Amino acid sequence: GYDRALSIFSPDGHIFQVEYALEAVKRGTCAVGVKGKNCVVLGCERRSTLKLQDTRITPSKVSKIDSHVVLSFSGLNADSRILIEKARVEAQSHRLTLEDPVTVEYLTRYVAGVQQRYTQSGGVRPFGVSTLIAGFDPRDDEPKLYQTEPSGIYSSWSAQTIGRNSKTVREFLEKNYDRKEPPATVEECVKLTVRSLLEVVQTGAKNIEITVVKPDSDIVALSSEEINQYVTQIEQEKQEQQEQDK
Amino acid sequence: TQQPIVTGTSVISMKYDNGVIIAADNLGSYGSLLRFNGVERLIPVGDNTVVGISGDISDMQHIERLLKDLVTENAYDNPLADAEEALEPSYIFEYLATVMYQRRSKMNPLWNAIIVAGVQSNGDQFLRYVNLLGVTYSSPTLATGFGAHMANPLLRKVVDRESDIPKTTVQVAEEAIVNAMRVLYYRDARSSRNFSLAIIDKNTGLTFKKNLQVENMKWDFAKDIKGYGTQKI
Amino acid sequence: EYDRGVSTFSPEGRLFQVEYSLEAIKLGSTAIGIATKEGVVLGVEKRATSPLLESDSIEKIVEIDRHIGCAMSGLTADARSMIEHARTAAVTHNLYYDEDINVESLTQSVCDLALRFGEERLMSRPFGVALLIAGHDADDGYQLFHAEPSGTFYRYNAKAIGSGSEGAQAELLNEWHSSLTLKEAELLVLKILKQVMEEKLDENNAQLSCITKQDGFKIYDNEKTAELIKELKEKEAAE
Amino acid sequence: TDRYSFSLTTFSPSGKLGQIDYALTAVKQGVTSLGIKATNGVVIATEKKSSSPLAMSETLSKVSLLTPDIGAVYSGMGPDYRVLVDKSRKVAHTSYKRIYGEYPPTKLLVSEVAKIMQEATQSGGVRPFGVSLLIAGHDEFNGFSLYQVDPSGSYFPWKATAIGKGSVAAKTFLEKRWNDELELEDAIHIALLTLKESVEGEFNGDTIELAIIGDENPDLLGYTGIPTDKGPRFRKLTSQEINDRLEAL
Amino acid sequence: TTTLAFRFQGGIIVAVDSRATAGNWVASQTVKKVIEINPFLLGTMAGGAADCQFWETWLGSQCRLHELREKERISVAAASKILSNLVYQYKGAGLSMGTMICGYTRKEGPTIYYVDSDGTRLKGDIFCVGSGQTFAYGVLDSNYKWDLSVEDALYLGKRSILAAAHRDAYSGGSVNLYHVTEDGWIYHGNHDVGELFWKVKEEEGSFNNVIG
Amino acid sequence: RNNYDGDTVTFSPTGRLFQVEYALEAIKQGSVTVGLRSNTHAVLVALKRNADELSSYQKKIIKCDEHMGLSLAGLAPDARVLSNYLRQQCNYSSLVFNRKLAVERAGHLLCDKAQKNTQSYGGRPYGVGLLIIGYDKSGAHLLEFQPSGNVTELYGTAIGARSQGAKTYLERTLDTFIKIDGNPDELIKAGVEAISQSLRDESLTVDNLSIAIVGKDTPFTIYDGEAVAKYI
Amino acid sequence: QFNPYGDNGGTILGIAGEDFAVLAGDTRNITDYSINSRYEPKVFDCGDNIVMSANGFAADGDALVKRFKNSVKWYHFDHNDKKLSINSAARNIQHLLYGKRFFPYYVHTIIAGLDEDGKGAVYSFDPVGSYEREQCRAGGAAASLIMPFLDNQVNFKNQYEPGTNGKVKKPLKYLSVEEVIKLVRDSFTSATERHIQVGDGLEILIVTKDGVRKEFYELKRD
Amino acid sequence: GSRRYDSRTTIFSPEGRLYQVEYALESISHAGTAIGIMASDGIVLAAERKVTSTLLEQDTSTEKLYKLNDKIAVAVAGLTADAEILINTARIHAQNYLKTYNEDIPVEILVRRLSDIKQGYTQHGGLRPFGVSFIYAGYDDRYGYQLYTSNPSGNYTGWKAISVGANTSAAQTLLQMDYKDDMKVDDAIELALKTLSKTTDSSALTYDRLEFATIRKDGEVYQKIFKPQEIKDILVKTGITKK
Ligand SMILES: C/C=C\NC(=O)[C@H]1NC(=O)[C@H](CC(N)=O)NC(=O)[C@@H](NC(=O)C(=O)[C@H](C)CC)Cc2ccc(O)c(c2)-c2cccc3c2NC(=O)[C@@]3(O)[C@@H]1O
Ligand SMILES: [Mg+2]
Incomplete structure (x- = not known):
């Protein structure tokens, strides 16, 4: 019934609704993804503002699409749920018709196509969500990390960040990530993630949420105590650097 | 239509040197009852085409309505509808044939056999056949139903090949048509003595004769037939 | 802007959204194609927006069929559906006719989607990407086509689209001849790309591909492209 | 082609649904109507503001029957109320009686009509209803009840209330005059007093409408022989009865 | 119609006949019952001539589309399951087809699937489909061994098709042979049954039931 | 202009449809083409336009049926849409009635197809003008079609940029070319001269010239490239 | 109860030589035990030097021929007048x-012409589309009568070289146009002699690299 | 034609916000206050009636608290009619889940269904969003006692204690100051009543302007909707009033 063209071109060659969706993404909590030699780490920021929130039931920023692929997002949470549900449905459909779980690239491409269709269909607004999809291809040990934007563009990244203050975290990553020597162990990857988050998540480990993906469908979310241990070690090394200068 | 109700019997037609002739009785049969007398089954379209229909009378009237509507629609925005852009016999045929084949393929056919006969703009004699199955064929002599079994053998002895058409005159063809009508009245139970005959001649135009009757019938020998074998009185 | 319809005519006789999408393409990346009697060459600027972006995941040159390749410029997201429709069209024409679809026919079928927008079902906006469709058929040999969201398509001996398309096109007009070879076209695409690119062109921010009658449509790997880059460097150093 | 598929009632930056407030305003300019719930019946009443003295006021009824135990009165735009009473009767028949063999209780019928009215404030190509309704009903498990339904689609249960022009003064008078021990005739008297307050012109059985949801009137059933089927509880008072009760105001 | 396919140490052996009949009337004996889906996938048909031919060509089109989309060869499992879901969508409509999808991939190795119009899809090592599948099955299962040479396995497939063509009246014409290895399928010639029978009878000392 | 040029469903206070005029202006900013008929033949001469020197020349002549074709001026996609509809109509005529579609009826169908878009909200009127040549049971016919829905039969006309020169040339040459019966080459040369009467700082070449001919003993055929060198 | 199918008899034959093809058909259109017409051709020229015949149900054959002609027209329209292989x-x-597939054309279809390499070619279709390229194929009523004769006189089946102890088959050889015309005439005379649905006339279309020509011969009318 | 009248309710602002979502949130902020508090042995819902009149039948009045099933209740803030529409849909979804799986519906599933409905209304259709905020209080065998909240934006979250409607900031601050993880249901009742009495815009808290509900624990949960006399008794007992 309602087919009004909401996403149209502007005289300078811009689709305003898409750009405003990107801005809505920039207003959401921060999310980061980093590739190791044999693991992928996804870190996310929790809004310190809310204190009476019970984490036993509140949805986490990292959601499983299959047993081996996870998706984090920045932006509107409801559109994120929509995209995650569609992605899970498509993953099960690909499993059913191909007898093989989907590749991270394929799931990322499906999500990007959904977003692009929402940027070119009538009566609908684009998704106010940017996504980081991570995992390992079936029977493959090479890590996989991808990013999709509201505009429908998707691309692979050694390490990436989305959301508010993503510029600072991206600078920290471009500085402290050597393509030649990725974090060989899971500990190095998690430490780099927690550092990148601490560059902007000023409050503490309570607001940091870390998940680790390892081949053969090994997805585990770190407890707040382990994140606190990591933050404590990073602070002790920072104070050691402060003392070695003396 | 799934089974015909009121039906008309055979329709005969043949070519000659300057045109074509078609004819059919005026009977509408409700099965074994000769219910309706005076039922014209020759539909003249324009001044150059005649459509002879046999089968379900209701579908025949539907085809009459379709032909009238086709003439009306061809008249629309056509300053040459009375001339170079008039309805040719081939047009009327092709339209009816498309309709018949479509109605067959939809499992709701027009329970009819149609013979379109006329003269084209260049004087050529057009004479073609279609039926509820959509089967189309064209022969110098065309008949439907019992005619196809009885009328054609008589009419084919006058024009067995195309080369025989220039040799046949209007009188010859009309006499043959009348003889075939008489033979059908002899040997067809669903036939009538009253019929109609149309002549489409590339020079005189359309000559349409109604209320014709089968004449010169031989029945005297029936007085000498007594018993089915051994009976003598 | 929003006060009018998407399929509204300007007083000059043009469709607003079409011209705006043309501007959007102007702000797009660079794509250059050159067609010669020995094959067609397509080169694109990857334009990785960060050193952490894995440049391999920048597929701006896609295969429509073994005999038809395509390069995109602008909003590459929009290109997805077009590429799918093109591939499907090719395979469907094969299934229906046991033969390869003509390059011009594929380009026309792609363009038939461009103005299928507005308010059976139409898209809201026209496409925001332009295409260079290169191919080979037994009727018109090697062919290179430019396809715009304007529904119109042209056949170029050489064509550049995207940022810098003006100067690139001029240099093509000055450096093209009917006796051009395949290696010469590769080096020419490399030179024009290195000129119009803000970054120093290497085998990671540029991509090369070629359609030949023998091997079909092949995208050059990083090593062959880097060797061609070294050859062009030696050529330019000694001129 | 109904291209108006978008909402005509949206939120303004001040957090206001403009069309709903304007419907309520149009209601405020409507003729005063009122309802009073007693211990053994409910009463609804309103003023018969005719257009021309040539027009026959009895042919147009402001008080209408929904079900044999549920009646309704309104304030606002007449035609909206007429189409609403038609829809309410049909929905009471379909979404309940054709399923349970009995007429719906008052609360459920009010909820159905409120859903109908709410759809007007959110659906495409439509304005909210320009009426406010007072529904007086009786069911076996909830007794007597009086509900008010606003254009916003919201409804409230009232011990007694009024809507229209003299709404505030009427509500104040009812707060000062009502108690939880009134009989039906006491409620009728209080309603007549409140109407005499909220009217300036003539006040007689021919210029006011008043109906009651009280006891069952088997004489109005039209058929005898079923002991479980009693007469309807809704009854509009005749002009003679109205004038008889006015003579003792 | 008689088709057989079995995997062994040297890959996969596929063997079909070439007779197509319309009742007692042999409509043709030049029928190619192996459809080359792609250089790595073969499809053997049995049953509905138009059904099998049309839908295996459509399967080839779908496999080409998958290769274009995913930049990767389609697996024997996925290729067979596409046609399986198709025929199940057409189940009960009047399709009569029994096909074998055979392939060699790096992920799966050598793989053979049987798919019929009833929706059945079975991965297997030895399959025979058609009117003369029983004679094939007999000869195969009596002389089968995983340690067969390429020569011996090709000859065994040829001989099973030959026996099925001799006994079954609806199978005959000529034997079409195929060998599927890592590098794809290799065509091993069209052998006319009329002469192949006499050759095998003279060289094997078998078919002693026929006068010759 | 403003407040009345947003839709094709809005009438101007003077009684004008502005979107229609904007489509007509889109026509005016196109390549020039000319059509001329006698009583035995009908010729379309079109000047194909190119982007630059490395680009092809956009096709301007489309074949609708063995007896009828057209030349476009303006939007190429709308021209293709209308030509495909006309092909469909001629094909339906031939298949259902074994009849060649009259050029007049084709013009009527195109007029109604355009009027459909010039009155309904959503969607734009077509943005291309057409010159239709056709030989039917009444002889040769030339039609000029504007996306306003107006189609007119003429002995000769022209559309596109600077079409007035060709139109005046035909107005003067009418008494001459109406008599060129049974000589295709002379009518082709007359059309080439008519289209040359609309050139500014440009010369006719084999690459930019397209010819179309239909007639009694000539099915609708198109000449491009070396085939037109005989007229330059 | 309405039967949407019918049989019009007829017989068609297709042969492919070295640089030519030939498609012949009887011109007798019949129904049950009655003749409808003695000259109703069913071997048509569709253009691009491609001759087609769908023999069996006359309505379905005509429908298929018309659809294929429309397909050739649209293939020329939509692919730059490319010649249809x-x-x-x-x-x-x-x-x-x-x-x-679920309401088939009750017709056996045969097309003939030249391939891309300029050699003769024939293609045969069952009523649902199972197609095959062959060198000789007969279809229709007398198909069962002509096909074995074809296999004997065109592919030289069962014909061994004399004295070779039944070991050397007759060398398969391309036939001349005159020989295939003789074979067609003999096949159709035999069909007219033994089959009641064949006769009246034989019409032959010959497709060479120069185009399509017609040869008509009379047949018995019994 | 009709393009001139379309408000386009589902479009982004230049900042990246949904106009109608923010305006509905404002409208809800202008509505009554509702407070949910989850305890270790139960959950409590309290709400203030903005409809206040001495002639309002508070017995048959439920404008803030509604029952979804036997294990889930909702506190409403905003337009009551849109709230009832969504509540009817939620009850139907709960019963459909029951008919399908023969087990009571988990709370978060119902919450996510309602939130996705809201989001769909904030992305397509060109219709106005639902001007309603929901506080869900439920019990499932998986997570025990659960307290959720949802707004017109289609977003939903979970809470130990939460407030919606008017003056939510001061209410949340007070709750965070006075909440303890080990409190009981009576402590939750006291805290909710004190927060409502301290953040009310009226003279003082009275029973006639209150709705109260408790989900308590046998292996069976009890969903008690408080009646006027029970509300007056719990008010005078907790010390908010005296009589
Ligand atoms: C090489 C692969 C299989 N080899 C065969 O040799 C198979 N033959 C065929 O498919 C022939 C082809 C031909 N040129 O004749 N099709 C018909 O005849 C047609 N049937 C007819 O009734 C007609 O004509 C009608 C007048 C028009 C449809 C088409 C058809 C229809 C429904 C079917 O369920 C089958 C075939 C079918 C299925 C399974 C096995 C066999 C079948 N039909 C059989 O005849 C056979 O038994 C044999 O196995
Ligand atoms: Mg015979």
Whole structure:
């Protein structure tokens, strides 16, 4: 019934609704993804503002699409749920018709196509969500990390960040990530993630949420105590650097 | 239509040197009852085409309505509808044939056999056949139903090949048509003595004769037939 | 802007959204194609927006069929559906006719989607990407086509689209001849790309591909492209 | 082609649904109507503001029957109320009686009509209803009840209330005059007093409408022989009865 | 119609006949019952001539589309399951087809699937489909061994098709042979049954039931 | 202009449809083409336009049926849409009635197809003008079609940029070319001269010239490239 | 109760030589035990030097021929007047027939022409589209009568070289146009002698690299 | 034609916000206050009636608290009619889940269904969003006692204690100051009543302007909707009033 063209071109060659969706993404909590030699780490920021929130039931920023692929997002949470549900449905459909779980690239491409269709269909607004999809291809040990934007563009990244203050975290990553020597162990990857988050998540480990993906469908979310241990070690090394200068 | 109700019997037609002739009785049969007398089954379209229909009378009237509507629609925005852009016999045929084949393929056919006969703009004699199955064929002599079994053998002895058409005159063809009508009245139970005959001649135009009757019938020998074998009185 | 319809005519006789999408393409990346009697060459600027972006995941040159390749410029997201429709069209024409679809026919079928927008079902906006469709058929040999969201398509001996398309096109007009070879076209695409690119062109921010009658449509790997880059460097150093 | 598929009632930056407030305003300019719930019946009443003295006021009824135990009165735009009473009767028949063999209780019928009215404030190509309704009903498990339904689609249960022009003064008078021990005739008297307050012109059985949801009137059933089927509880008072009760105001 | 396919140490052996009949009337004996889906996938048909031919060509089109989309060869499992879901969508409509999808991939190795119009899809090592599948099955299962040479396995497939063509009246014409290895399928010639029978009878000392 | 040029469903206070005029202006900013008929033949001469020197020349002549074709001026996609509809109509005529579609009826169908878009909200009127040549049971016919829905039969006309020169040339040459019966080459040369009467700082070449001919003993055929060198 | 199918008899034959093809058909259109017409051709020229015949149900045959002619027109319209290859025509006809897989054209289809290499070629289709390229194929009523004769006199089946102890088959050889015309005439005379649905006239279309020509011969009318 | 009248309710602002969502949130902020508090042995819902009149039948009045099933209740803030529409849909979804799986519906599933409905209304259709905020209080065998909240934006979250409607900031601050993880249901009742009495815009808290509900624990949960006399008794007992 309602087919009004909401996403149209502007005289300078811009689709305003898409750009405003990107801005809505920039207003959401921060999310980061980093590739190791044999693991992928996804870190996310929790809004310190809310204190009476019970984490036993509140949805986490990292959601499983299959047993081996996870998706984090920045932006509107409801559109994120929509995209995650569609992605899970498509993953099960690909499993059913191909007898093989989907590749991270394929799931990322499906999500990007959904977003692009929402940027070119009538009566609908684009998704106010940017996504980081991570995992390992079936029977493959090479890590996989991808990013999709509201505009429908998707691309692979050694390490990436989305959301508010993503510029600072991206600078920290471009500085402290050597393509030649990725974090060989899971500990190095998690430490780099927690550092990148601490560059902007000023409050503490309570607001940091870390998940680790390892081949053969090994997805585990770190407890707040382990994140606190990591933050404590990073602070002790920072104070050691402060003392070695003396 | 799934089974015909009121039906008309055979329709005969043949070519000659300057045109074509078609004819059919005026009977509408409700099965074994000769219910309706005076039922014209020759539909003249324009001044150059005649459509002879046999089968379900209701579908025949539907085809009459379709032909009238086709003439009306061809008249629309056509300053040459009375001339170079008039309805040719081939047009009327092709339209009816498309309709018949479509109605067959939809499992709701027009329970009819149609013979379109006329003269084209260049004087050529057009004479073609279609039926509820959509089967189309064209022969110098065309008949439907019992005619196809009885009328054609008589009419084919006058024009067995195309080369025989220039040799046949209007009188010859009309006499043959009348003889075939008489033979059908002899040997067809669903036939009538009253019929109609149309002549489409590339020079005189359309000559349409109604209320014709089968004449010169031989029945005297029936007085000498007594018993089915051994009976003598 | 929003006060009018998407399929509204300007007083000059043009469709607003079409011209705006043309501007959007102007702000797009660079794509250059050159067609010669020995094959067609397509080169694109990857334009990785960060050193952490894995440049391999920048597929701006896609295969429509073994005999038809395509390069995109602008909003590459929009290109997805077009590429799918093109591939499907090719395979469907094969299934229906046991033969390869003509390059011009594929380009026309792609363009038939461009103005299928507005308010059976139409898209809201026209496409925001332009295409260079290169191919080979037994009727018109090697062919290179430019396809715009304007529904119109042209056949170029050489064509550049995207940022810098003006100067690139001029240099093509000055450096093209009917006796051009395949290696010469590769080096020419490399030179024009290195000129119009803000970054120093290497085998990671540029991509090369070629359609030949023998091997079909092949995208050059990083090593062959880097060797061609070294050859062009030696050529330019000694001129 | 109904291209108006978008909402005509949206939120303004001040957090206001403009069309709903304007419907309520149009209601405020409507003729005063009122309802009073007693211990053994409910009463609804309103003023018969005719257009021309040539027009026959009895042919147009402001008080209408929904079900044999549920009646309704309104304030606002007449035609909206007429189409609403038609829809309410049909929905009471379909979404309940054709399923349970009995007429719906008052609360459920009010909820159905409120859903109908709410759809007007959110659906495409439509304005909210320009009426406010007072529904007086009786069911076996909830007794007597009086509900008010606003254009916003919201409804409230009232011990007694009024809507229209003299709404505030009427509500104040009812707060000062009502108690939880009134009989039906006491409620009728209080309603007549409140109407005499909220009217300036003539006040007689021919210029006011008043109906009651009280006891069952088997004489109005039209058929005898079923002991479980009693007469309807809704009854509009005749002009003679109205004038008889006015003579003792 | 008689088709057989079995995997062994040297890959996969596929063997079909070439007779197509319309009742007692042999409509043709030049029928190619192996459809080359792609250089790595073969499809053997049995049953509905138009059904099998049309839908295996459509399967080839779908496999080409998958290769274009995913930049990767389609697996024997996925290729067979596409046609399986198709025929199940057409189940009960009047399709009569029994096909074998055979392939060699790096992920799966050598793989053979049987798919019929009833929706059945079975991965297997030895399959025979058609009117003369029983004679094939007999000869195969009596002389089968995983340690067969390429020569011996090709000859065994040829001989099973030959026996099925001799006994079954609806199978005959000529034997079409195929060998599927890592590098794809290799065509091993069209052998006319009329002469192949006499050759095998003279060289094997078998078919002693026929006068010759 | 403003407040009345947003839709094709809005009438101007003077009684004008502005979107229609904007489509007509889109026509005016196109390549020039000319059509001329006698009583035995009908010729379309079109000047194909190119982007630059490395680009092809956009096709301007489309074949609708063995007896009828057209030349476009303006939007190429709308021209293709209308030509495909006309092909469909001629094909339906031939298949259902074994009849060649009259050029007049084709013009009527195109007029109604355009009027459909010039009155309904959503969607734009077509943005291309057409010159239709056709030989039917009444002889040769030339039609000029504007996306306003107006189609007119003429002995000769022209559309596109600077079409007035060709139109005046035909107005003067009418008494001459109406008599060129049974000589295709002379009518082709007359059309080439008519289209040359609309050139500014440009010369006719084999690459930019397209010819179309239909007639009694000539099915609708198109000449491009070396085939037109005989007229330059 | 309404039967949407019918049989019009008829017989068609297709032969392919070195640089030519020939498609012949009887011109007798019949129904039950009655003759409808003695000259109703069913071997048609469709253009691009491709001759087609769908023999069996006359309505379905005519419908299929008209659909294929329309397909050739639209193929010229939509592909720059590209000549339709014979294999492409065969594939398109397969799809046309399989379009009514569940309401088939009660016709056996045969097309003839030249391939891309300029050699003669014939393609045969069952009523649902299972197509095959062959060198000789007969279809229709007398098909069972002509096909074995064809296999004997065109592919030299069962014919061994004399004295070779039944070991050397007759060398398969391309036939001349005159010989295939003789074979067609003999096949159709035999069909007229033994089959009641064949006769009246034989019409032959010969497709060479120069185009399509017609040869008509009379047949018995019994 | 009709393009001139379309408000386009589902479009982004230049900042990246949904106009109608923010305006509905404002409208809800202008509505009554509702407070949910989850305890270790139960959950409590309290709400203030903005409809206040001495002639309002508070017995048959439920404008803030509604029952979804036997294990889930909702506190409403905003337009009551849109709230009832969504509540009807939620009850139907709960019963459909029951008919399908023969087990009571988990709370978060119902919450996510309602939130996705809201989001769909904030992305397509060109219709106005639902001007309603929901506080869900439920019990499932998986997570025990659960307290959720949802707004017109289609977003939903979970809470130990939460407030919606008017003056939510001061209410949340007070709750965070006075909440303890080990409190009981009576402590939750006291805290909710004190927060409502301290953040009310009226003279003082009275029973006639209150709705109260408790989900308590046998292996069976009890969903008690408080009646006027029970509300007056719990008010005078907790010390908010005296009589
Ligand atoms: C090489 C692959 C299989 N080899 C065969 O040799 C198979 N033959 C065929 O498919 C022939 C082809 C031909 N050129 O004759 N099709 C018909 O005859 C047609 N049937 C007819 O009734 C007609 O004509 C009608 C007048 C028009 C449809 C088409 C058809 C229809 C429904 C079917 O369920 C089958 C075939 C079918 C299925 C499974 C096995 C066999 C079948 N039909 C059989 O005849 C066979 O038994 C044999 O196995
Ligand atoms: Mg005979």
